[PDB]
Amino acid sequence: GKTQLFPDSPLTDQDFSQLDQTVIDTARRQLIGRRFIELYGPLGRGIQSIFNDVFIENYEAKMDFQGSFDTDIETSKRVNYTIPLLYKDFVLYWRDLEQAKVLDIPIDFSAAANAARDVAILEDQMIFYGSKEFDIPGLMNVKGRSTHLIGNWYESGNAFQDVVEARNKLLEMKHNGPFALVLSPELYSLLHRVHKDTNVLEIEHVRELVTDGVFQTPVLKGKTGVLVNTGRNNLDLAVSEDFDTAYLGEEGMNHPFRVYETVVLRIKRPSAICTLED
Amino acid sequence: SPLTDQDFSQLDQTVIDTARRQLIGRRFIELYGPLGRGIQSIFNDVFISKRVNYTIPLLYKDFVLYWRDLEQAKVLDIPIDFSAAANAARDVAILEDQMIFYGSKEFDIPGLMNVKGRSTHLIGNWYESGNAFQDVVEARNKLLEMKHNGPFALVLSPELYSLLHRVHKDTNVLEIEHVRELVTDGVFQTPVLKGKTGVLVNTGRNNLDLAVSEDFDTAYLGEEGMNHPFRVYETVVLRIKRPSAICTLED
Amino acid sequence: SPLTDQDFSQLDQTVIDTARRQLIGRRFIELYGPLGRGIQSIFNDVFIETSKRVNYTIPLLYKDFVLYWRDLEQAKVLDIPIDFSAAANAARDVAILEDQMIFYGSKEFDIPGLMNVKGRSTHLIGNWYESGNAFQDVVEARNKLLEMKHNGPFALVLSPELYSLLHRVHKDTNVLEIEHVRELVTDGVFQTPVLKGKTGVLVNTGRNNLDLAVSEDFDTAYLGEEGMNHPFRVYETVVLRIKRPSAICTLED
């Protein structure tokens, strides 16, 4: 196992397994974008860049008697994306490890949770805004997406009207699949009032149209939201290496570790995204 | 055949799963078997008997796989991307649902919302409480007066389906739970219908059915410029035998 | 017969299912067995509050449909299942005729029906548009039936209009009138299109009050080839015996 990878590690196989379990459990509870985006299978270390095809037009099926000789294919542009690396560091102290070993006390993996939280926050930020250095577009700044302006959401019923208008805008472009809604926390809290007309909570009424769930993320500030047509053919996440931990070697009698992963986001059809902005 | 049998199997499964998750009409309409390729037209007897002939149409959509990506896939031993196949399969299902709910004006095939001999019900303002229940009850009464007492299915536009999500006055229950026992075959919604429209249909293979010749399938169009084009196709048609067993909630 | 055993079995199954899902009277009325074809008349003793014996003649109900040789030839060539569609229409028509005979009798054979027998109770209904009136009317009808030493499980049959009018919310109550009505009527509430307007019937069920004598159930017969086509006929022989006319209350306008 991980002991073979780092034979000079203070921990044992059980401790490494517990650390990995803690890291993955902390990562799972914090990842928002992975709740409605499919994962392209783990490729491996044999790749360092990916290819993305961006479409600009949509064609529908045809009805005929026997068929046709010509083949109709939409025009697409090919681009190259560089897979970035995201990582964080934490330290374990020798005195605490020795005391736990001599007292037969379970080891406290608290810094690993903070490292995993920071890595997850960085990944969410990259997904929702893109990497400026590598020039990778994000959900809220892609080119060719639809834009909607929201009104005053303090008055009851306005949010439902805005969501309906965004859905109509997305539907007029031959997009009928299930939708997902992501909001800033300030707007998310405003949906927990009582709809006077229907005598129900506004969030419950909104959840009827958005059948893939409504989520909120802290990376969005102020009045900000996005409506996305869920589908593998529309957007995807390519993962080279998932969340993992590495031992950096002893230094100053203290043992540092690193938590790292390599992911990227591919947007195929920018027309399947609507952004609700102030 | 650039792909081996495993890749073809995954392609077929991907197309089938993508199509099945989107189809609405197949959830409450029976199929008249996979007849085969030996038939090209069907006969319908409207029992009011009048015999008509319907020509079975063909629905298809094409996509393409490139060879560089495939070769890299076998080189690196990684799963093959099939996003284009799913994107193609979605549109075929959408077109099939549109044809089922509105028919083809060029093939001269009636749809559920425009067939002759049906019943029409004018709905009221659904923004209040209880109006939807009254409208559904009246539509079911109209259907019942025509010697039709069987399982019923209700299909609504998303706007009306959302409007149904309210509180039934004086009983403190959701109206949807008060409708699900009258309409014992379920309530469905589909984006095909626009505005405030709906349909109530008495199910049963003796009232209406779907005749299919070839189900969803994939065909290789042959190599072209070292690439690989593919086609996704199917041949289906809808027969309505008792037009009186349909009530359209219009506005 | 052009059909083999399998097609005959399928035809019988289709006719049986169509008849079973369409018959209303058979839901709350007992059957006096399959008697057979050795009996052509029955005896009914009416108790009036004594016994009067009356001879009833068993009628025959039938309807004909046809299969076209071109369709069976095409189905045989293409190896596709045959289409038994006219049989469903014939079975539906026969069932409708039987229900009409049960609820109104035959004037030719002077057999009384449920809504026109002599020695029954009649109740005049009010305006059922207002909430609560129907509950009061049903309660009063059951009270009328109660002061006759009749307390068995009751059954209610209504016209579709009255049946639909009953699906509102009871005034000053959370529940609908359907539940309150079904509380009193423990044998179910049925509706049929045979009744027209605002009419209904409340019947104290039981073998000793009324029953059905069936000499031959639903069956199919081959009439022989004609014009290369194939006609068939669906038929049955039933009759209704009412023994205690006092156990019926008819709601009329």
Cβ–Cβ contact C66 with B under 8 A: no
The amino acid occupying position B202 is N
- Whether C164 sits inside 8 A of B137 (CB atoms) is yes
Residues across chain A: 278
Residues of C in contact with B45 (CB under 8 A): 85
Nearest residue on chain A to B66, judged by CA atoms? Answer: A53
Considering only alpha carbons, which residue of chain B is nearest residue A194?
Answer: B166
Which positions in chain C touch B144 (Cβ < 8 Å)? 160, 163-164, 191, 193
- How, if at all, do strands B208-220 and B31-34 pair? parallel
3 state SS of B9: helix
CB atoms B138 and C164 under 8 Å: yes
Resolution in A: 2.8
Question: B245 vs chain C: nearest CA distance in angstroms?
Answer: 14
Q: B217 touching A, CB under 8 A?
A: no
The minimal CB distance from B86 to the residues A60, A171, A233 is found for A233
Instruction: Report DSSP state, residue B200.
Output: E
**Shortest distance, CA C10 to any CA of chain B (angstroms):** 14
Q: Which residues, 6 or more positions from C70, have their beta carbon under 8 angstroms from its beta carbon? A: none
B61 vs A63: CB contact, 8 Å cut-off?
no
The Cβ-side half-sphere exposure at C233, using a 13 Å CA radius, reads 11
Query: Which chain B residue is nearest to residue A238, measuring alpha carbons?
Result: B81
**Structure determined by:** cryo-EM
The verdict on B173 touching A (C-beta cutoff 8 Å) is: no
B216–chain A Cβ distance below 8 A for any pair: no
Which residues contact residue C216 at a Cβ distance below 8 angstroms, ignoring those fewer than 6 apart? Answer: C34, C36, C37, C235, C236, C237
Which structure tokens are listed for B121? 């019900």
Contact C65, C75 (CB under 8 A): no
Integer Cα distance of A142 and A272 in angstroms: 11
* CB pair distance less than 8 Å for B78 and A177: no
Question: What Cα–Cα distance (Å) separates residue A245 from each residue in A17, A30, A113?
Answer: 11, 18, 12
Which residues in chain B touch residue C169, judged by CB atoms under 8 angstroms apart? 130, 170-171
Measured between CA atoms, the residue of chain B closest to residue C93 is B147
Nearest alpha-carbon partner for C215 in C14, C80, C61: C61
Residues of B in contact with C193 (CB under 8 A): 144-147
For residue A266, the cross-strand partners are: A236
Say how far apart CA A272 and CA A171 lie, in whole Å.
9
User: Which residues sit opposite B202 in a β-bridge?
Assistant: B152
**Interhelix angle B83-102/B5-20, nearest 10 degrees:** 40
Interchain contact A232–B (C-beta under 8 A)? yes
As given in the structure block, the two tokens for residue A200 are 């129900």
Query: CA-to-CA distance for C159 and C136, rounded, in angstroms?
Result: 18
**Which other chains touch chain A, taking contact as 3+ CB pairs less than 8 Å apart?**
B
CB contact under 8 A, C78 and B39: yes
Report the SS3 class of residue C196. coil
- The vertex-C162 CA angle with C156 and C166, nearest 5°, equals 85
Distance from CA of C33 to the nearest CA of B (A): 27
Amino acid at B145: E
Beta strands A235-247 and A39-40, pairing class: parallel
Given an 8 Å threshold on Cβ–Cβ distance, is A176 in contact with B94? yes
CB distance from B221 to chain A under 8 Å?
yes
- Residue C188 touches chain B, beta carbons under 8 Å: no
Q: Which amino acid is at A88?
A: K
Query: What is the SS3 assignment for chain A?
Result: CHHHHCCCCCCCHHHHHHHHHHHHHHHHCCCCHHHCCCEECCCCCCCCEEEEEEECCCCCCEEECCCCCCCCCCCEEEEEEECCCEEEEEEECHHHHHHHHHHCCCCCCCHHHHHHHHHHHHHHHHHHHCCCCCCCCCCCCCCCCEEEECCCCCCCCHHHHHHHHHHHHHHCCCCCCCEEEEECHHHHHHCCCEECCCCEEHHHHHHHHCCCCEEECCCCCCCEEEEEECCCCCEEEEEEEEEEEEECCCECCEEEEEEEEEEEEEECCHHHEEEEEC
Cβ count near C126 (within 10 Å): 11
Q: d(Cα B233, Cα B217) in Å, to the nearest integer? A: 6
Q: Which of B38, B137, B150 sits opposite C21 (nearest CB)?
A: B150
- Phi (first) and psi of residue A32, to 5 degrees: -90, -45
β pairing state of B246-250 and B119-122 = parallel
Cα distance between residue B57 and residue A63, in whole Å = 7
DSSP state of B244: G
Q: Which residues face C180 on adjacent strands?
A: none
Do residues C118 and C112 touch, judged by C-beta distance below 8 A? yes
Q: Which of A256, A229, A230, A253 is nearest to A245 (CA)?
A: A256
B31 touches chain C (CB under 8 A): no
Whether there are 3 or more C-beta pairs closer than 8 Å between B and C is: yes
Searching chain B, which residue's CA lies closest to the CA of residue A60? B91
CB-based burial of residue B102 (10 Å sphere; 0-12 exposed, 13-18 middle, 19+ buried)?
middle
H-helix or E-strand spanning residue C104: helix C86-104
Q: Residue B123: which of B86, B74, B82, B156 has the closest Cα?
A: B156
Residue with tokens 């009036």: C48
**Amino acid identity, position A37:** I
What are the phi and psi torsion angles at C38 (to 5°)?
-80, 0
Contact flag B91-A61 (C-beta cutoff 8 Å): yes
- State the Cα angle at A130 between A124 and A131, rounded to 5°: 110
8 Å CB contact of C78 and B36: yes
Whether B84 contacts chain A with CB within 8 A: yes
- The chains in contact with chain C, meaning 3 or more Cβ pairs closer than 8 Å, are B
How far is CA C226 from each of CA A130, C8, C68, rounded to the nearest angstrom?
80, 19, 10
Residue A63 has its nearest CB partner, among B58, B127, B221, at B58
Calculate Rg over the CA atoms of chain B: 22
Rounded distance, CA C109 to CA C111, Å? 6
Q: Is A63 on the interface with B (CB under 8 A)?
A: yes
**Distance separating alpha carbons of residues B220 and B204, to the nearest angstrom:** 38
| Shortest alpha-carbon distance between residue B41 and chain A (Å) | 11
Length of chain C: 253
Q: What is the dihedral of CA B22, B23, B27, B33, to 10 degrees?
A: -140
Establish whether chain C is in contact with chain A, requiring a minimum of 3 CB pairs below 8 angstroms.
no
B58 touches chain A (CB under 8 A): yes
Instruction: Check if the beta carbon of residue C129 is closer than 8 Å to that of residue C167.
Output: no
DSSP C199: -
C229 touching chain B per CB within 8 A: no
Cα dihedral across residues A195, A201, A203, A207: positive or negative: negative
Of B62, B79, B86, the CB nearest to A72: B62
Contacts 24+ apart (CB under 8 A), C105-108: C105/C240, C106/C59
Tell which phi-psi region holds residue A16, choosing left (phi > 0), alpha (psi between -120 and 50) or beta.
alpha
Contact A73 B87 (CB under 8 A): no
Nearest to B62 among A41, A46, A71 (CB): A71
CA of B49, closest CA in chain C: separation in Å?
A: 10
B80 DSSP assignment: P
CB C185 within 8 A of CB C154: yes
Quote the DSSP letter at residue C193.
S
Q: What are phi and psi of C237, to 5 degrees?
A: -130, 110
